[PDB]
Amino acid sequence: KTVVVTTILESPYVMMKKNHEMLEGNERYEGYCVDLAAEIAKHCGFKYKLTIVGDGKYGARDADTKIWNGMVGELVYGKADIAIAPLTITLVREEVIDFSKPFMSLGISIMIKKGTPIESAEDLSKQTEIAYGTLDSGSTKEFFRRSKIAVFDKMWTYMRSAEPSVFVRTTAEGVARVRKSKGKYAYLLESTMNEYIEQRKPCDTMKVCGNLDSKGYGIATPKGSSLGNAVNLAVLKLNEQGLLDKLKNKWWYDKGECGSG
Amino acid sequence: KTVVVTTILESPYVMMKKNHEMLEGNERYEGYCVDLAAEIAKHCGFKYKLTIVGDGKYGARDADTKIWNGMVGELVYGKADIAIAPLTITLVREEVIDFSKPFMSLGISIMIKKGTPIESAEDLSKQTEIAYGTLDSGSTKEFFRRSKIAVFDKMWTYMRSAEPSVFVRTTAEGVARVRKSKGKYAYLLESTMNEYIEQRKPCDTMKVCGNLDSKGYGIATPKGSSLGNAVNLAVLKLNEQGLLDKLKNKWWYDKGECG
Ligand SMILES: N[C@@H](CCC(=O)O)C(=O)O
Ligand SMILES: N[C@@H](CCC(=O)O)C(=O)O
């Protein structure tokens, strides 16, 4: 029985090679999560097929219908057997899916144009001439909606109120918004992606110092999945061997295009 | 009549214009604290004269001799009526002079050459092949001297004992030492100046994220000065009016060469 792996196009976790138009199957994709998916399949011993999430979203729950979208949705409604993507382990998501122990750490961070007069999240709260927003349906927006910190709650109010909408449908759109906005838009995105983009051309982006919290990515499986335990202890057997850190160094910093390292 | 303002050459707070040799008086100087001095004098309503501290130091107290040097020294001994400079508000200085409320926040930070394998102050404490030092007579040196945190005390011991001299007499000397040291010297300086240098050519210096503490700059006046209240309410009306942030952005980022 073939295993259907649900994932999302997100640099550097899953990208499509240049020759991806003359290729088929799993040989079209490249990144941290494709290799991680391969090695996970080797340790567990199942053949798998890479699928991109249909709606292109990570996973949020409608307040009124209590329905789920994105990869979490595709797991709850039996559209995929396992999710191998930068999917943050959150309390709400744990209600409907199972998470392995974190295979990578991260935290919400700010991304600005190099040379911009911003130095903190509280600075963002005070000012108004620079806009800032969040991904459309991800751990970040959920964090700001349910946050009780005064600064974070204020930022949330501004974002929900500020129009022309400050939110974005894909992180790429956010980074592009920052780069084109001539330092008038700052993007709130997870630290890993911020660092990655920071170390790649045109080298005009900067990560502000300070993570707003500390979470991690986990391997998600449907509640009651026969594959849950195997992958859950598998990622630990890969952490002991240190291959996860070798992958991080492989895709983030071993080939940094900007300045120095 | 005229009030003598004591200050210090420290970019971008007080600098000398590109010409300045074709100018005289207060029109030779430029920076954050020159403008702040202008607005303070406007709100209070006094004509002032800008003077650079004679010994070129901020302010420390000899343990045995007591006595003060730098701008604080010039304030205690009636050599100047007010000090408008990046002068950190500390308890010891507050014992002998008066400080307005902070017009700018800051914290001790590390400055490295871009491409250096350092990520924290504790990393510096553990290793020994990379040197690190501080300004000679400022809030930073006193911070490391009177710190009881294990790492900070260890760094202090290293700096004071191991000396191919690691200290510097002016911030410029520190930044130059970092740039020339090929990533083998890291400079411990307040975060604000580190950010400024980070935003100026040749764009080869970097500020580590971890700040070692959190303090602020205040306008200093001698104990019992008639100008204390006036300047305090001036800086409060300028923080309320928001001009301080416009000045920070003006001198740090409005003319950033590294981006
Ligand atoms: N990895 C996050 C994406 C949200 C973000 O980048 O802020 C998630 O699982 O939803
Ligand atoms: N500005 C500091 C000195 C600079 C430093 O120690 O980094 C003071 O008021 O003493």
Numbering used by the authors:
A (entry chain B): 4 to 264
B (entry chain A): 4 to 262
Quote the passages of the study that discuss this structure, keeping the authors' original sentences.
AMPARs mediate fast excitatory signaling in the brain, and a change in their number or function underlies lasting forms of synaptic plasticity. AMPARs are homo- or heterotetrameric assemblies of the pore-forming subunits GluA1–4. The activation, deactivation, and desensitization of the receptor is controlled by ligand-binding domains (LBDs) which form a self-contained clamshell-like structure within each of the four subunits. Following glutamate binding, closure of the LBD clamshell around the agonist causes separation of the D2 domains, applying tension to linkers between the LBDs and the ion channel which opens the gate.
To test this, we introduced cysteines at sites on the central axis of the D2–D2 dimer interface, cross-linking of which has previously been shown to inhibit channel opening by trapping the receptor in desensitized-like states. Thus we compared S729C, cross-linking of which permits the relaxed dimer conformation, with G724C which we predicted would not accommodate the relaxed dimer conformation when cross-linked. We also crystallized isolated cross-linked G724C LBDs in both the apo-like ZK200775-bound form (G724CZK) and desensitized-like glutamate-bound forms in two different space groups (G724Cglu Forms A and B). Instead they displayed a non-biological conformation, with a large rotation and total loss of the dimer interface which cannot be accommodated within the intact receptor. Thus, the Pro632 separation in the intact, cross-linked GluA2 G724C receptor could not be meaningfully assessed. By contrast, functional cross-linking of a different mutant GluA2(R) G724C/γ-2—which did not assume a relaxed LBD dimer when crystallized—trapped these receptors in a non-conducting state, indicating that this conformation must be distinct from that of native desensitized AMPARs.
